[PDB]
Amino acid sequence: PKESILKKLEDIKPEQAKKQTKLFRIFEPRQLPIYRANGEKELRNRWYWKLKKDTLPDGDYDVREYFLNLYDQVLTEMPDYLLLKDMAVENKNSRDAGKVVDSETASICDAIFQDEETEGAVRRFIAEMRQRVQADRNVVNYPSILHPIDYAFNEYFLQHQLVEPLNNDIIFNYIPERIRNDVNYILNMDRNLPSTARYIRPNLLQDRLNLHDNFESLWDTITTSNYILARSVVPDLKELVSTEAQIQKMSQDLQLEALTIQSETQFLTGINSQAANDCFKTLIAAMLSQRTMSLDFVTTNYMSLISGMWLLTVVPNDMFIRESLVACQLAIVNTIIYPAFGMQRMHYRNGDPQTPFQIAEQQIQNFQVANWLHFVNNNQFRQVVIDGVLNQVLNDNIRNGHVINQLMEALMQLSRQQFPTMPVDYKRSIQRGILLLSNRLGQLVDLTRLLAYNYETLMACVTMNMQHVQTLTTEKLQLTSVTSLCMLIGNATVIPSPQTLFHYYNVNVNFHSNYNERINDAVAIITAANRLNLYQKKMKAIVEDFLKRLHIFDVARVPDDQMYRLRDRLRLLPVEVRRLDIFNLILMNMDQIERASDKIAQGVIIAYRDMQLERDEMYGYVNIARNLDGFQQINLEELMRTGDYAQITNMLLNNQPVALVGALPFVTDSSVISLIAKLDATVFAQIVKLRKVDTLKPILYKINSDSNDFYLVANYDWVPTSTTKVYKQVPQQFDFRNSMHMLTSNLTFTVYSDLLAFVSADTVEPINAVAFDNMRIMNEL
Amino acid sequence: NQVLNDNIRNGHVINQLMEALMQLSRQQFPTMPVDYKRSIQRGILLLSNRLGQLVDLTRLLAYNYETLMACVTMNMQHVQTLTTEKLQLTSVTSLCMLIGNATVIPSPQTLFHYYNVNVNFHSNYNERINDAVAIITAANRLNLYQK
Amino acid sequence: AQIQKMSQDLQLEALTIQSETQFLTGINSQAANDCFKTLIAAMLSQRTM
Amino acid sequence: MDVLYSLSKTLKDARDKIVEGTLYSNVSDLIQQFNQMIITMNGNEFQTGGIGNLPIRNWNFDFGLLGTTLLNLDANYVETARNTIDYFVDFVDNVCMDEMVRESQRNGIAPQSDSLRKLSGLKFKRINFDNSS
């Protein structure tokens, strides 16, 4: 309760400064003996590429999901910016110091630089391989070895760095183009930014989610929030006629007595040393958050009504609920304006729907009275766009802002109907109250000014493009307080503290940034989620996290519904270049990763026909085919899903040349023997007994009579006759020279969070402030 | 198998639902006190949003009935029973906005068991029928004018 | 969860004199199962309600 | 086409019902209709003319709305309006004339000008009214 949504709000710091150290790679080169055709180890040994972590699954599906997590890890580690002075390392060799990039880089060199390799050209290169700085442009040249796929990564990380410059001018510019402009306030800074500055652009695009169309439930929660936020600002008022004094002259001016009541119920309204401040705050926030309030009055508290007219003249009515403006107006129309304006006859009969206030317009005649009606009735909000960047602000009719000829007119109309009558007395109590508005009018003129400004000020600070809808939790406001605020003010002038204002900006800011950001985080995922065919990662998942990261919301305490509809809208959104640009990268090569690396394969072919084996250098000559040219196929993923249509069962039974595809467990064997016995024709049996298969551990034959104690056969003369080889590309080799890449980045940066702070915001003397009319706000003494 | 069916439309083509909703999406207007349309339409929307899911419901039944049904020997003409079976809109309403990506069906073993029963039963009915008839007819050409 | 967002949406107590005769909705974790079953059998069985 | 029509009874029932004096109520149903238009327009560009001795003029739209605020129209209200109508007048003229010259056999009936072919567009239909001419 109350200060329970504020501590959750003030306590929001999405401004994390993401950065990195380790150059993100995936494959470290490794050893392994060389097998020259004929199957002998020729020594020296060559260098190939395998992956750090062969995690890869069992089943195409589990595979795809796996990668997915990579995406999430990539984003959480997503390097916001980058710098290399912090990446230094040393080269054991070279024309000198060497200072290169990332431990791994180092290791490798020293390593190859010992195990007698291709000789010269390598040692040589490693040598005159250094760094150098082009100081002038603040540029940096650091050498580094990676792998086509690695350069790929880290590269874009450099060509992207979301860190724009930072000059005095930009600081000045992020201070709303309507406040620096506002006179009454003054800026001022204590330092001069270096050419070395930078800043993170907290992006704040609009409600890419039209969260007001049908979702009411949540808007209400927002408004609420934005509202409390507001009160936390709305300047606490200053010095106003001591409670007692006023209320005492109050009893006087009216003339009271003994069991002779008339106006006596108009002062359970005093308490304003509380009410005025509440009524004041409450009113603004309402506007800002653009929340809708209710109305608690009496029908015997006429005064309380009069002041209503004050209110009404102001807030465009649409700002209050329907069932409330209805009551109010008719209450006025029926017990306030007819019953002393010899207009009764029909105490006004009403039946709901249409506009019970309005109708009073085309009703009786009198000009003063008549203008009020049109001005109040058809008075709305002015829908205004841009405000020094898409603010999408709702403003109050220029007219009203201090050029309050409305108040003066609201009074003149009151001064003129206090003429005719009907029930003899009654008028006494009624008009007496009316006059208390008149005298005070000199001051009432003020109140208007106040709000006028304040709302009109605070405003700018909102980046949360507020709109105009019906709330639902409806904040409550009594005519009690209203009335107090009214006759109880003047001579005073109050205004938004500097520090206060910023704080306001800052918050909405963050918040925005978070919304926008998570949005991107969200989208990115879902889209990836589709071009993955994960018809099994039920999305009730993403939405949840999303909302959560936006505190305030009782996640568990909100249905599965709205949630889905939420996806439906997200799905139709683009991705932030950053996000997107990376996924394209992951996919594009995806294949290459998978296929390489052990612990898996791809698929197996069963040609009931003897056949040769490739002689690749890595392994001796074994069971492989990077092409599977011909034969039919059968997705396993679509198998253990389809429930196997004995299609496979039949083909296996009848022995027909065929193949399989997907995630698979390889199994290495040696002792030639196994081969001649044609062992690999086994395994396949299983299946028949078990519709589903994973129990399928396919066969491979790493064979080089060098390491295979059973060489006896390489002897005679020969050629490897197998039945059924394996789909699995082969780990590219390692051409160091070209396997390296070069890097650029910057030197001695300087990141800054928050900003603003750099200003001793001071204020003029209250007694002479100004509004959008260049006039002294508060001049009546 | 006289097993009164129903719209492929209903089946999974579902749309009726989509139309049941679209028709709802344009009922938001005046006439009486405010505490009315407010409360009313707000409820309606809860059907709408959920509509994405309400769809699923149709599918569900569509299948289930359309499935179970199969294993019924006992023909089934439509008749006006003499007894009702109370159904509290209470539950109805729940089921409605209260179902998510759930998806259940008839366990194999379950289905058979169903067939089996109707089967037996049938067989019994039919059989006793014969047992019955046989007797009565004999009963007449035996002049056993009694039972 | 649902019934709570329900009150947010529903605007429960708003003047009307006959409250809490709309929320006997409960025991739904069950009601749905009953309503569901009940509905099918009705059909199959060739019952009327 | 029907579009075109409105654009006029709009102005006539306008340049006629809108003058120094009248009480709002005789035009509430009118003002509205009017504004609606302005909106749909603003932003779009038009090509009028380009044949014979016919001036080729371009037209941009960026105009305000109306003050439903006042009661009995004050002179000042009119002038700030007439000035906005006189662009539509001098416009429509250049519009009618442009499609009042082109002809075609096959599809002679339908609209021809780069001005009108864009009017039959869907995003405009939000304008029709009082077709008693």
Swiss-Prot record, chain D:
The N-terminus is blocked. It is found in: Virion. Transmembrane segments: none annotated. It comes from the Viruses. Residues 62-73 are annotated as: Interaction with the inner capsid protein VP2. The VP6 trimer contains a zinc ion located at the center of the molecule. The zinc ion is not essential for either trimerization or transcription activity of the DLP. Zinc-depleted VP6 has an increased sensitivity to proteases. Intermediate capsid protein that self assembles to form an icosahedral capsid with a T=13 symmetry, which consists of 230 trimers of VP6, with channels at each of its five-fold vertices. This capsid constitutes the middle concentric layer of the viral mature particle. The innermost VP2 capsid and the intermediate VP6 capsid remain intact following cell entry to protect the dsRNA from degradation and to prevent unfavorable antiviral responses in the host cell during all the replication cycle of the virus. Belongs to the rotavirus VP6 family. Homotrimer. Interacts with the inner capsid protein VP2. Interacts with the outer capsid glycoprotein VP7. Interacts with the outer capsid protein VP5*. This is Intermediate capsid protein VP6. The chain holds residues 1 to 133 of 397 of the full protein.
